[PDB]
Copies of this chain bind each other. A is one copy, B any other.
Amino acid sequence: GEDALINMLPLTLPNEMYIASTTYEPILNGDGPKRFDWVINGGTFWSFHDPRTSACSEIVDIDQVEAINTKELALHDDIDEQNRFSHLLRQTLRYQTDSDLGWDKDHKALYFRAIEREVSRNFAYTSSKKKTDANVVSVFVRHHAFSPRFELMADQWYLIITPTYYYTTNGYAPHQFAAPLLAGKKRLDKSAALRGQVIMWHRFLYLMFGEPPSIHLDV
């Protein structure tokens, strides 16, 4: 009845992991799709789903694929395996929406990429009650973003989304000569803005993200 949203995504993964081994320190560009990045582990190669016989980027040696299920390897007890797997998940999430979303090194954000100058695009997603739009190219330029974080919680795997409003700086320039402008917009009323920014974020959607849990009791 009094349930509320949760800022992490219940990832659903198939029974295929494609464990391998390489020698690299993470990208040699590529010649095909945008899934030719160095999505590797610390010493070994941890790839993901692929429509080819070889793994991603075609740089790992042939006949060195374990091809084991997710439950055998991704569920470990030491924190080093969790950190490695979550870094891999962040790497395969950043280069998954590369044609639409960009990543910046400061503040750790996946923002909307600008197509031109003085953009007037709108993002619309469906809902059960009505249709709600969002303007993410507002110029006074800033767009919308989020930050991913690591979480396992034993049974499943999670990417934590923090909806930063990204009001400071956007465009081709890295920073508008260090000129930020932001304040507190969200409030602890019956509704909120951050959760809203979580709900209307759908550009992140074999990383088949489930809906955030939103099951709570507040007696």
Contacts and interface: CB of A to CB of B under 8 A. Distances in A.
Interface of A: 26-29, 34, 37, 95, 98, 102-106, 171-175, 177-179
A171 to B, nearest CB: 5
Given A105-B106, A106-B105, A27 B174 contact: no
Contacts of A29: 177, 179
A98 B177 CA distance: 10
- State the number of copies, please: 2
A105 B173 CA distance: 11
A104 B177 contact: no
Q: Which of A27, A37, A174 has the most CB of B within 10 A?
A: A174
Nearest to A111: B174
A105 B168 CA distance: 14
A95 B177 contact: yes
B178 A27 contact: yes
Given A171-B172, A172-B171, A178 B102 contact: no
